[PDB]
């Protein structure tokens, strides 16, 4: 398949990304608590449902939530201010809460079943969100870094296999603050560092210029 792109909702961020996040890729956004990673996830879950002329892929979404941070009412607001019907947008987001890291890993295998079901339809899965990818692994493997890296490596390999095999954009969030971080090392296809700037602006930089945007009723925008 050709590489598809999903607009982030921000012209600035899209330019930094060469058009948007890519299918057949894992995009990892990392930054401190409150930097806007989950807002970017919510916005992408709407943007992907637009036609290509508007930066989407007419796609369905699967969302794995590890922190109970998915907000349907926020999806509705973004959809309504992106010219879409909010009920339709929500009906094309499959949502699951991961209870722990082992359940999170099983959910990725379950996602493949729905990906296959929708593959030949007019609304194939085009976006798989894992928010937060690392939170359960970090809390469960305190004092056991070697084992944590083994399990994370398999989880990321599963996510890669889905991105490439089914032409999906995988978007993952990772909280990294004071003294923290192996990030995801070199595992993602693309690492985006997100931070707060003056006056509520958010600033994005590729790790391995900078885009600037705001969080608004449209999700994010310049």
Ligand X SMILES: Oc1cc2ccccc2cc1O
Residue ranges that bind ligand X, judged by CB under 6 A: 62-64, 94-96, 107, 110-111, 114
Complex with ligand X: residue 95 or 141, whichever CB lies closer = 95
Residue 133 neighbours by CB under 8 Å, 6+ apart: 28, 66, 155, 172, 173, 174, 184
Q: Rounded to the nearest whole angstrom, what is the least distance from the CB of residue 152 to ligand X in the complex? A: 18
Distance CA 131, CA 69 (A): 8
Distance CA 139, CA 12 (A): 35
Complex with ligand X: residue 12 or 134, whichever CB lies closer = 134
Complex with ligand X: residue 25 or 62, whichever CB lies closer = 62
Q: Rounded to the nearest whole angstrom, what is the least distance from the CB of residue 131 to ligand X in the complex? A: 11
Complex with ligand X: residue 13 or 170, whichever CB lies closer = 170
Q: Identify any residues that bridge with 219 across adjacent strands, giving them in sequence order.
A: 216
Q: Rounded to the nearest whole angstrom, what is the least distance from the CB of residue 182 to ligand X in the complex? A: 25
Q: Rounded to the nearest whole angstrom, what is the least distance from the CB of residue 104 to ligand X in the complex? A: 9
Residue 128 neighbours by CB under 8 Å, 6+ apart: 61, 62, 63, 64, 111, 159, 162, 163, 168, 169, 170, 171
């Amino acid at each position: 398949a050709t590489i598809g792109r999903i607009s982030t909702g921000s012209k600035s961020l899209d330019k930094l990304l060469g058009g948007g996040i890519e299918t057949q890729a894992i995009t990892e956004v990392f930054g401190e608590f409150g930097s806007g990673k989950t807002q970017l996830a919510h916005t992408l879950a709407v943007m992907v449902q637009l036609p290509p002329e508007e930066g989407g892929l007419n796609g369905s979404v699967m969302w794995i939530d590890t922190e109970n941070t998915f907000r349907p009412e926020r999806i509705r607001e973004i959809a309504q201010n992106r010219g879409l019907d909010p009920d339709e947008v929500l009906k094309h987001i499959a949502y699951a809460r991961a209870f722990n890291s082992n359940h999170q890993m099983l959910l990725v295998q379950q996602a493949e079943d729905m990906i296959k079901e929708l593959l030949n339809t007019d609304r194939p899965v085009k976006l798989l969100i894992v928010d937060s990818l690392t939170s359960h692994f970090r809390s469960e493997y305190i004092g056991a870094l070697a084992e944590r890296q083994q399990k994370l490596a398999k989880h990321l390999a599963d996510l890669h296999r889905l991105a490439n095999l089914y032409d999906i954009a995988v978007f993952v969030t990772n909280q990294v603050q004071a003294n923290g971080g192996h990030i995801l090392a070199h595992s993602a296809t693309l690492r985006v560092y997100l931070r707060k700037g003056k006056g509520g602006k958010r600033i994005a930089r590729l790790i391995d210029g900078e885009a600037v945007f705001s969080i608004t009723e449209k999700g994010i925008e310049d």
